[PDB]
Each structure stands twice: as structure tokens, then as C-alpha cells.
């Protein structure tokens, strides 16, 4: 378990980060925010402040019951400026609620999971093995592993592209 926080200088301005920087969900308005070259200008994305070069690292994620959220990890080099496809070629290995269904966001086609209703999810990042893995805390059922030859710093990633849903880091 890692105590991760959200990097408000990466966040889309349409996002609303919780006081403690653990929560995120879409607002209905852009905000005046000092556009860095590191901020996600168009896609509804925010990384964690802390990224990883080496080792195993766990975070847990409380997810909504309604569509809008994807999350997982992204390589540091993930493009920030412009509309960017949400795919492994673009440096993004994620889980997704969309049409009331859980998907590993693979390409060319997305992979549907036949997992049960999800509430909280453990994210296992193994850089020394070259994999990011997703488990339901509810019994540590394995949801999906992406096998990836990471060749750089890898950051926790969160996207919320509809109102009515959210993601919360635990702990």
C-alpha cells in the first residue's frame, strides 16, 4: 500500500480534485489554472504526484457505479496537449466503466471483463516483472493484468469524462 495523492498541476481544469487530493470527478466549468506544459489541457486526466522507476507498488481505488471513469498507470511521456486517444500505444494501461460494463482498455478492440459489481480496486504495479495488475479488494479476485515492457517512469493515472461518477484513492 502507497499513500498516493493527485497532482493538481497535471489535472484537466474541467476536473474537481478533493480537498485532500485523493478524489476526482468532472465539474461543469473550466477553471482559471496556470497552464503548465505538464497539465492535461483536453483529456479529462490527472496523474498522481508520485511516479515509479523500479519495484512493486500497490494503490487502492474506490470507483463509482456510473460510467465516466478509467484509471491505471501511464508512462511519464503520455501526451498532455490536445485530444489524445486513450490506448496502450499512447502510454495508458487502464480499466474503464462504459455502458455499465468493465473493460481493460486494450486495442485494436477493448477487452470486456466478466467481473461482478466493483466498489474498491487494488492496483499492483510490478516494474521488475513488467506488468500492471487489477484486483477487486472484495475477495482479491484478479480482474486483469497488462504485461508491459516499461522503459521509463510510470505514473498512476485517473480519467473522469462524465459527471455523476468519481475515483477516490485509498488509503
Amino acid at each position: 500500500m502507497v499513500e498516493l495523492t493527485l497532482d493538481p498541476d497535471t489535472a484537466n481544469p474541467r476536473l474537481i480534485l478533493s480537498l485532500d487530493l485523493k478524489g476526482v470527478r468532472l465539474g461543469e466549468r473550466a477553471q482559471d489554472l496556470p497552464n503548465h506544459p505538464c497539465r492535461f489541457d483536453t483529456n479529462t486526466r490527472v496523474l498522481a504526484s508520485c511516479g515509479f522507476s523500479s519495484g512493486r507498488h500497490h494503490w487502492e481505488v474506490e470507483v463509482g457505479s456510473k460510467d465516466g471513469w478509467a484509471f491505471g498507470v501511464a508512462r511519464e511521456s503520455v501526451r498532455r496537449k490536445g485530444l489524445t486517444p486513450f490506448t496502450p500505444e499512447e502510454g495508458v494501461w487502464a480499466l474503464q466503466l462504459n455502458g455499465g460494463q468493465y473493460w481493460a482498455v486494450t486495442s485494436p478492440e477493448r477487452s470486456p471483463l466478466s467481473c461482478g459489481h466493483l466498489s474498491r480496486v487494488r492496483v499492483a504495479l510490478d516494474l521488475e516483472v513488467g506488468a500492471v495488475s487489477f484486483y477487486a479488494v472484495e475477495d482479491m479476485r484478479h480482474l486483469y493484468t497488462f504485461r508491459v515492457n516499461f522503459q521509463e517512469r510510470v505514473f498512476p493515472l485517473f480519467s473522469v469524462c462524465s459527471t455523476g461518477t468519481y475515483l477516490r484513492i485509498w488509503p
Binding site: 483529456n43 479529462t44 486526466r45 465516466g68 478509467a70 486513450f86 474503464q96 482498455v105 469524462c161 462524465s162
Partner: peptide, 6 residues
Amino acid sequence: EALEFQ
């Protein structure tokens, strides 16, 4: 369009 912003 909403999902295009993921």
C-alpha cells in the same frame, strides 16, 4: 463526445 475525452 463525452467518452472521446478519456
